[PDB]
Amino acid sequence: TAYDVILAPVLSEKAYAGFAEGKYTFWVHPKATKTEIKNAVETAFKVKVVKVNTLHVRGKKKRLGRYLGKRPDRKKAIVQVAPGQKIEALEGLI
Amino acid sequence: MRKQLEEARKLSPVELEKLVREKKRELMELRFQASIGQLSQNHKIRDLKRQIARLLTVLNEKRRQNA
Amino acid sequence: MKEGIHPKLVPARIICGCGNVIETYSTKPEIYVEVCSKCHPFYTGQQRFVDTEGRVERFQRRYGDSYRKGR
Amino acid sequence: MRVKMHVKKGDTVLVASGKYKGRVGKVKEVLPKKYAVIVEGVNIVKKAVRVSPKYPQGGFIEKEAPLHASKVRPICPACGKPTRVRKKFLENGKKIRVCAKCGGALDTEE
RNA sequence: GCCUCUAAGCACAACCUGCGGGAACCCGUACCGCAAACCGACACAGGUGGGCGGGUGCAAGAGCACUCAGGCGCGCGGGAG
RNA sequence: GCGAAUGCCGGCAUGAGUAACGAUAAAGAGGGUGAGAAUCCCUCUCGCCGUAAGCCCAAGGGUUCCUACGCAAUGGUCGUCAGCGUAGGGUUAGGCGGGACCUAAGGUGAAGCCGAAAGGCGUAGCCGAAGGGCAGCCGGUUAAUAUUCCGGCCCUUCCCGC
RNA sequence: GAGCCGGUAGCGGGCGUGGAUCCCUGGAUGUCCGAAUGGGGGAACCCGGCCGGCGGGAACGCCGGUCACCGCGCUUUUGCGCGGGGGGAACCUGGGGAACUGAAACAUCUCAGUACCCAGAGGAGAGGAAAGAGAAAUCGACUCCCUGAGUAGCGGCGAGCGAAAGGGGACCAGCCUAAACCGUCCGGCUUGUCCGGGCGGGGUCGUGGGGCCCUCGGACACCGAAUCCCCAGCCUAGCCGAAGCUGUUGGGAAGCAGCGCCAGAGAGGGUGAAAGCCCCGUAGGCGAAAGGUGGGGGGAUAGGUGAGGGUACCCGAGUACCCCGUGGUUCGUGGAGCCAUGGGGGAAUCUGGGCGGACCACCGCCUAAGGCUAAGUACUCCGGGUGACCGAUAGCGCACCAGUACCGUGAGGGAAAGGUGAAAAGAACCCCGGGAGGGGAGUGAAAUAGAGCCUGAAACCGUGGGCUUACAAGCAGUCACGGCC
């Protein structure tokens, strides 16, 4: 309840380029308002939240023998810096 | 660490507040850790959750007891 | 419920018949009426003091509204 | 053989069994009593994985089944299990009393 | 939306208009899709809403014939006859 | 306690290796890949479309789409190919669309009228649509998405100020 | 009481006798939908107005607290302070209310006041102190079981339908309220002297109440939870808890054999093949907690009941009663009463007034036109126990990722599928193959117990062997004989 926490970083391939020079791609709480994202991102990270884009994608085909299922909802959102700062560690990383 | 249980008891206002806030954040740290050490980390995560759960249960105790 | 009575309840039922007598004058009756029906009262009004009405039904009606005529 | 058990880590005997030579037992379940006597298993000729020597097989085998292990062996082997007369403040210590006796006494051994 | 007056404030902080600074969220987009991905229990010759329909020839033009592009050669073959 | 009830349920034979392999728009050759390819991959001959077997919007469908491996089930045999199996990765928009607005048919319904009760009816107000209204378009850029990404040029509304 | 991070074991990390896993009672937010209720909306999604906050501040965007409708009575002012609603398998009451079918037609009739739609209370509702029953100067609430009769009787007296009082039994209490008359009274009208609405006395049980005069007269009765504290029953956790070892064919022994034993507990199951004494916290028995529920016994709180005559009458119902249209009744049209109302007439205050006997004169009965409640029959969702009840095509269709796969537009329909073994010891590794899968080694008691792998039998399809067959007519066969083996 009011734990500001709302994310799991996007480490996907293309996601990379952005980490390389400006836009960092992350996974966010499925429902985290765009202004919400500015809040979380800016506050937790000491960053410069410019253009926060957002997309959602549910999952599919995973079979369990006699029956099957398909995963939950993976929520995607990507926000860009201002000068190139913050997320450093993260980026050199993935 | 029912001892942590104690510390919990102890704190209260913007105290418990900021304390739980920060710690939760630490757990965020954890979440990010999801892809690094991970091995001895497991606990840190399950537990950490648990612990903040504590903090919370407490604030309820404290201020609800109040009003 | 939109027309029981008001000065009590008179809103319903009944199965109704028919044949053709001759009982205690000659022979048996004659019966062939498995019929069903309505059966009811009526509505009206007066005034509290310039502004009123009534609604109500028939008899219980009449002496009733009188009752409120007393006050 | 339910939420309730006999001998714990403990040590005991094999009545109608295939060893009798009772001794230290690995573990015990709680409902599926299942316990290991560290007294008889196999190899499973193993995966052939470097899990075991890259060239391999399985080693310590001992999932101790049957419940004909004659629990507790005080200075007396085949015995049942007692209770308490308390004698001391809050005295569970359902320790084992039957001819010889043993309770697992926290000292000199488990 | 332009104007036009009440509430009523406005009228000294309302609307018209500048420039600068600053903000602007939620759900959608992949691909099929005149169709083996949609409607027929099927990779069913049935059906299914709008959009020039490239050129040439013919009186006329989305009829006609070859074709432009771009699309195919149908999902069992061989073989005598 | 049952052949036997065109009986029930399940197997299982039977024409029978015959009937067909879903449109008369045709294929044929050459290398490549494989464990094996008429049936997969390139290349070269040929034919059928084209005013459709066009390209696009939408509808509906929703996984698939790509990428790597993979076939024993599935494609009316084929198959090492798939729209098939596993995994991983994949659609972001102040200016496109829909709602943050408008109204119709019609529906709901604070009032009101009215039914044995379940209701019927119903002003206004509200819901209600590629009908109204509303601020961009073009070039480039991935395996994949793009008037959203990037770049170029042109706007929009609402907030603070002056 | 010493092991566990759920069905998943596996990876990769752990926690605990300085009461860990788990068992119960109470906790805490507890996403969004759903009576939904702040608004809208194809539910499980988009919108908003107020105080709070944070952020880049305003615009924006979250958490928070907030804010339908209702009738309900209250500060009738400005209205704040309570309730309902939405459920629930069968059970219940009232509203409404059906054809088949029977009558071997089918119209009164039967199926029935049944099925079904509905509203509503519950945990049970239902009914519930007599204008009752009943003819002996007699019983005495209601409900339910047996009986009363399938008689009394209802009826195209046709098919059929079909009481009650009393007896036996279970269960056993009764209290109220307008009832002007009192007075208190405050509000009234208009004022003296009617009506209104609060407190009484009365507050009708089997009848009176009251008002006026004298006998009055000074302590036992608790509910329909009065109500309160208790042992509080359980809820789930409890725990003890009798006696055997050797041998022995055996992969097994709990069995065959030797001796010893238990017992107010030889109920069952589990232990590798059939134990009272190996395992089971069972009957043997005892056990148990501060939470969630009272019948008991007890107290107290005890609202509230509880006397005598007399005297002009004032004092429980707007509808009784009558006539026509009907319901209920064993009453179907009737000599047909009573109860219940649609319709029009339209009284009475205990000499009142209905009830038995259509009705009349009698006698006898009860006291209506308001109110409240225990208990004894109901029902099965859910728990527990049991079966001359089932064993996987019968059981609930459901034995286990069956109300779902799948058909349907929807309402709706509604499958199949259980077993290797004692335990994983379930298949290293060598061999043909692309693979499966096939042959070896180890499993082993078995693997013709091998992974849908127990028992796995019929149809049907295959490899091998004996006999038999190309001038043969016959569903079938089967009596004889002979060649073959």
From Swiss-Prot, chain A:
A cellular-component GO term for this protein: ribosome
Record key words, sorted: Ribonucleoprotein, Ribosomal protein, RNA-binding, rRNA-binding
Cysteine pairs bridged by disulfides in the record: none
One Pfam family in the UniProt entry: Ribosomal_L23
Record GO terms (molecular function): rRNA binding; structural constituent of ribosome
Record-level GO BP terms: translation
Family matches, as InterPro entries: Nucleotide-bd_a/b_plait_sf, Ribosomal_uL23-like, Ribosomal_uL23/eL15/eS24_sf
Family, similarity comment: Belongs to the universal ribosomal protein uL23 family.
Annotated function: One of the early assembly proteins it binds 23S rRNA. One of the proteins that surrounds the polypeptide exit tunnel on the outside of the ribosome. Forms the main docking site for trigger factor binding to the ribosome.
Subunit structure: Part of the 50S ribosomal subunit. Contacts protein L29, and trigger factor when it is bound to the ribosome.
Entries under HAMAP family matching the protein: Ribosomal_uL23_B
PANTHER family, per the entry: 60S RIBOSOMAL PROTEIN L23A
Record protein name field: Large ribosomal subunit protein uL23
Organism of origin: Thermus thermophilus
UniProtKB/Swiss-Prot annotation, chain B:
GO CC, any one term: cytosolic large ribosomal subunit
CDD domains: Ribosomal_L29_HIP
Gene responsible for this protein: rpmC
Name under which the protein is recorded: Large ribosomal subunit protein uL29
Organism: Thermus thermophilus
Similarity comment: family membership: Belongs to the universal ribosomal protein uL29 family.
One GO process term, biological-process aspect: translation
Keyword Membrane among UniProt keywords: no
GO-annotated molecular function: structural constituent of ribosome
Keywords: Ribonucleoprotein, Ribosomal protein
Curated annotation (Swiss-Prot), chain C:
PROSITE patterns referenced in this protein's UniProt entry, alphabetically: RIBOSOMAL_L31
Keywords on record: Metal-binding, Ribonucleoprotein, Ribosomal protein, RNA-binding, rRNA-binding, Zinc
Lineage, broadest ranks: Bacteria, Thermotogati, Deinococcota, Deinococci, Thermales
Cofactor note: Binds 1 zinc ion per subunit.
GO cellular component, one term: ribosome
Protein's recorded name: Large ribosomal subunit protein bL31
Organism (species): Thermus thermophilus (strain ATCC 27634 / DSM 579 / HB8)
Pfam family, one: Ribosomal_L31
Family in the record: Belongs to the bacterial ribosomal protein bL31 family. Type A subfamily.
GO BP terms in the entry: translation
Annotated residues for binding of Zn(2+): 16, 18, 36, 39
Known cofactor(s): Zn(2+)
The protein's role, per its UniProt record: Binds the 23S rRNA.
Summary of subunit composition and partner proteins: Part of the 50S ribosomal subunit.
Residues annotated as signal peptide: none
InterPro entries per the UniProt record, alphabetical: Ribosomal_bL28/bL31-like_sf (IPR034704), Ribosomal_bL31 (IPR002150), Ribosomal_bL31_A (IPR027491), Ribosomal_bL31_sf (IPR042105)
NCBIfam families: L31, PRK00019.1, PRK00528.1
HAMAP family named in the record: Ribosomal_bL31_1
MF-aspect GO terms: metal ion binding; rRNA binding; structural constituent of ribosome
Swiss-Prot record, chain D:
PROSITE patterns for the chain: RIBOSOMAL_L24
SMART domains xref list: KOW
Keyword RNA-binding (UniProt): yes
Pfam families found in the cross-reference section: KOW (PF00467), ribosomal_L24 (PF17136)
GO terms of molecular function: rRNA binding; structural constituent of ribosome
Lineage: superkingdom: Bacteria
Any GO BP: translation
One cellular-component annotation, GO: ribonucleoprotein complex
Xref: CDD domains: KOW_RPL26
Family note: Belongs to the universal ribosomal protein uL24 family.
Protein name as it appears in the record: Large ribosomal subunit protein uL24
Gene giving rise to this polypeptide: rplX
